[PDB]
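Purpose: get a first structural picture of the assembly so the mutagenesis plan has something to point at.
Setup: three entries, given in the order below. No constraints added.
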Amino acid sequence: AGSLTQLLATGSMDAALTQNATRTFWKSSYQKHSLFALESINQPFTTQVQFGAESHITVNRQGDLLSWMYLKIVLPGLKVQNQADTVQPTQQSFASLDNDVAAQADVSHVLPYIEGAYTEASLNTKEQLIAEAKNSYEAAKYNAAPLPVAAQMQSTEMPDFDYAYWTEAIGFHLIKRAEFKVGGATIDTIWSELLFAMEELMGRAGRRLTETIGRTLRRPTELMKASRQEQILYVPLPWYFTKHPSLAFPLVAATYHNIQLWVQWAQLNSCIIKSRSNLVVLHAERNVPISDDHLRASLECTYVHLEAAERDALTANAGTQLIVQHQAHLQQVSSNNVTARLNFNFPVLEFYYFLRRKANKDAGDHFNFSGIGGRDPVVSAELLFNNTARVTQKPAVWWRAVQALQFHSSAPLTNIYSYSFSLSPEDPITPSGSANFSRLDSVELALTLQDDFGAAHDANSELFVFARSYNILKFTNGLAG
Amino acid sequence: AGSLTQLLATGSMDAALTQNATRTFWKSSYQKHSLFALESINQPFTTQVQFGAESHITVNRQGDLLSWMYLKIVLPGLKVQNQADTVQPTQQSFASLDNDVAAQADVSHVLPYIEGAYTEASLNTKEQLIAEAKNSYEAAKYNAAPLPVAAQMQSTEMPDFDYAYWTEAIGFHLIKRAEFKVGGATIDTIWSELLFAMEELMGRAGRRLTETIGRTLRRPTELMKASRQEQILYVPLPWYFTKHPSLAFPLVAATYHNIQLWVQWAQLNSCIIKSRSNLVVLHAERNVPISDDHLRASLECTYVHLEAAERDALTANAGTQLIVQHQAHLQQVSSNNVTARLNFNFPVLEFYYFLRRKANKDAGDHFNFSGIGGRDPVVSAELLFNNTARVTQKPAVWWRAVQALQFHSSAPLTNIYSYSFSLSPEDPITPSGSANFSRLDSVELALTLQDDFGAAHDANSELFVFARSYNILKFTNGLAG
Amino acid sequence: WYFTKHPSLAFPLVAATYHNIQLWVQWAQLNSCIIKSRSNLVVLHAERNV
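Result (structure tokens, whole complex):
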């Protein structure tokens, strides 16, 4: 009686929701689709792959569309030997944990707050004086309550043996820049720092790229274990056509253009960290000093094979694809107040920004976007259009956590900040907002950074700003532009 | 002036995106739906439930559709007593940690690499010699750099007291096979190993089945804690009709067919691990030896009640549902080169494969798909159609991590490999690609496994291959087929 | 086979489309394939040590 009465208890308001219902929950409807197949094919580079060099590949035409694209990287296992035991000790310098430049830079900021005879003190006494000076510095700069000295003395249990390892997220770090080219024109460009920021914000829970890019979430012991043997990494290249099947790049519609991936590789000296400064780093299998020619890479492409009728239709009329392109503003930082002039073009969906200390970069911690003592490097930021506040001054947590909560699949674990003009900037096919930067005379991101950011040992810290913008790729008569 | 100018700054390209806009972001539109209610009802098995037996239930007709289906399992708490203190010590044998068959099998592979007097050595000296021989084995087989001996000596802090526990993910392990039957015909079949693989790949972040199936992510101390008391598990049965409301099984349209769930239960000896070989395992409440009749299970079904008009429409014309069925190829492995002949039928969406060492199975670690020393058991795999490479030789990481990244909600934490012909194999209502195996004369999965896989103590290791295929379930005149 | 002796005798697969082509092989017994130095030796697979 009650369940039937609920179906009868309808009024004029229910008519807007349920009158002439076009859907039922109790019967499945499905759509028929055209026939297609997927094939994954690995292809060698057209030029030699080496650390610090640029390499390119011309993408083969082994199907009708191009869908997924992965850079397959093979890194050798690492071993170490004392320089005294080596017949040829001359190698490039690597970052070493016995010379922690990031910790030395952090100590340099607290030196003015050390009370007593620091120079003559025992090692254990120096560690105590540094921890007390950190409390005095943080009280003076941040009105922070002092932490117990014992809570600041975190011994990272480093192993009592010699090692070397590939840096955190080495699969991204290796790709300093990649360019997707069609007919000799650059269609899009991606950077190592952008790839990491995109994975932090858009990386879905349970599908994080951890193993596929050599990322351990800053657990040095796991990087050491992984680096003792050969590593095979599959780094996704997040081009517009890899984001949705309807955006797959129509190879058949671009028949008269070569499709090329160009990759600028990281220098070998930046890719490795060692336990001690006096160690030589060896290729684990070959027992020779590691060299720039030990980088191996290939391109793994997923091709789509279409039925003849769909292939012929696509060849006759591929039309236009909405694309997202990436733009970059890269700036050196030498002061706590920084203004970035964002000379980006087109309808910008969103931008990302973050800072890297010089000391973190020099320590080989390339994706450590933290400030001094691991703090947030940004105090506040403001966004100006033509000297008018588009976003008034907001604290770092608003740009990092509130913007990520509103617009992104994930909140960043590092100090990555974002701002979206789009309601759904991760939707590759549905435009949901933008600001046209080609119609603004000035776009300025004004930053107030933490105290002493870009001073002394951190002179030439880096500001990264990346923007995502809409453009249109047109296919006509076997050409793409 | 700027924001109004952006709305006016439109050209012929914007017309394809925004001309005659059929959607606004500033006004919600909603659809009205028909009246329905959901009811969860628990039902006993029609036959006795016991370990190692087969049991069935005829599903009641308590609503118009059948939606969710959970196997509700009740396991008793476990206690242990010394065999010497027990009035009836005769029980089935259980796996025991004092007789670690998996560790003994791993040691057997490194015995040829032990230098010195192993037989006469002290226990601590034997552990050192085994860790050194592991380095020599891994250097010889994999060109691995040696790990410090202290880093290989992981003491799992096992408690200094007697215990027994239910094996990891016991809720899946208990279900050796389940069959969904309609009118005496098997509509679909699921296996323990498939349920685990499906949860690894399709299990969403924050909705993993951990507690609901007794899974701890291989933390033995948590399995011990859970096993001291009665456990109630709710194991989801992932039938086609549980995946989307429009696929709910139309009970009213199948009025003349009995709906049955058949379950083949795991043997009790495989479900329990104990600290020591000389312990008797007791039911914690009853203080009697644990026996095959201590398994309790019931079926929890979610029924849908429809409004009379929708019920009558569905009874008159339920039509056809697209269904996904599961197929299995199960093979013994006795060599490092394995060819699996996949005699699957219908349009296959995707397949999963993985290996289990005999030693891992015998140790009671039923979902440990790792190789020797916890390594990846697959070096490479190739997929052939009619002796032509459909997927050329690819390394294990491509089949495990790249395929999961492209097509699945999650990457597997275990050595589960997949391959999809579908762009969205987790979409239950939208076909997005398949390969029709009923039109292929041969489908071969060729595997190169790690060295010594399936040799000696691992003779009769297991290869599992599961496929998901499209079929059609038709409803006509109160019958389903 | 006759078709391996001269290119003009190559077996025309296209002309035999409705027939399966099969090679059947009867293998020698393992006991006949091996000779050993001494009667009291066990013969092992060199890699597998079985």
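The radius of gyration of chain C is 21 Å.
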